[PDB]
From Swiss-Prot:
Active-site residues, as the UniProt record annotates them: 130 (proton acceptor)
Full-protein positions shown: 257 to 533 of 533
Protein name: Proto-oncogene tyrosine-protein kinase Src
Domain of life of the native organism: Eukaryota
Subunit structure: Forms a complex with polyoma virus middle T antigen. Interacts with AFAP-110. Interacts with GJA1 and PXN.
Native organism taxonomy: Eukaryota, Metazoa, Chordata, Craniata, Vertebrata
Length: 260
């Protein structure tokens, strides 16, 4: 068979983490030695080939900043085993207990990691389509990886949302929206504004203001990610290097604040 396939005995579903339209998410043990994240498919709510798509994708993929696929059960009921991320989504991590202590240096580090994962995605000429906090997983030691790689109007670039023009450059746009989530502790972009207002206004050239206590150089970085011309936007290789050198090359004067 495929090198991925594993016996059904080698999987233990210990703790339920979520339940969606097409299956469940569990933490468990693989081979009674390896803690893992296990995703399930509900027969009769999804096509086997349809769900077993994002899996065939993560087969070619392999980066330290991308959630790693471990194994599969291609026969129904389906099971998809990946590396376990202990902190859940970046969104929950940012909103909950841990949030209150996260500072600018840590949030910029997490951004640098994600940009590193998207930089690999960039080199492989791939597109994500849903880059946001809800889809970034956190692990031990403030580690962050990209996931779910196979309407978010407030996250989607105008060209993609309107004309379905989805590229790595519309991924960069979503990255700028991801930058606000990190700097506002996981608050929904364009607060007070519905989906309809966002489409009109972004099209009018409106962009989210500098978040409270956020350096203008970082908000400046966001505005580069939000250039209406897809090709005007920066690359994830730039973004990555700009964030990794941030507190030396960009903001050497940094001093801790109340929230950031």
């Amino acid at each position: 068979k495929d090198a991925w396939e594993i016996p059904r005995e080698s999987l233990r579903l210990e703790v339920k983490l979520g339940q969606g339209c097409f299956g469940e998410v569990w933490m468990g043990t693989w081979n009674g030695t390896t803690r893992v994240a296990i995703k399930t498919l509900k027969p009769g709510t999804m096509s086997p080939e349809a769900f077993l798509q994002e899996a065939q994708v993560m087969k070619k993929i392999r980066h330290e900043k991308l959630v790693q696929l471990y194994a599969v059960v291609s026969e129904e009921p389906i099971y998809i085993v990946t590396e376990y991320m202990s902190k859940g989504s970046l969104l929950d991590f940012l909103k909950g207990e841990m949030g209150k202590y996260l500072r600018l240096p840590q949030l910029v580090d997490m951004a640098a990691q994600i940009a590193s994962g998207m930089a690999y995605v960039e080199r492989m000429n791939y597109v994500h389509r849903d880059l946001r906090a809800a889809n970034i997983l956190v692990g031990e030691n403030l580690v962050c990886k990209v996931a779910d790689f196979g309407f978010p109007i407030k996250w989607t670039a105008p060209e993609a949302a309107l004309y379905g023009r989805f590229t790595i450059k519309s991924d960069v746009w979503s990255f700028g929206i991801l930058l606000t989530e990190l700097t506002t502790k996981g608050r929904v972009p364009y607060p007070g504004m519905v989906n309809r207002e966002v489409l009109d206004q972004v099209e009018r050239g409106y962009r989210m203001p500098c978040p409270p206590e956020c350096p203008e150089s970082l908000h400046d970085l966001m505005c580069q990610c939000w250039r209406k011309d897809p090709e005007e936007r920066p690359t994830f290789e730039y973004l990555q290097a700009f964030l990794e050198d941030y507190f030396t090359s960009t903001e050497p004067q940094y001093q801790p604040g109340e929230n950031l």
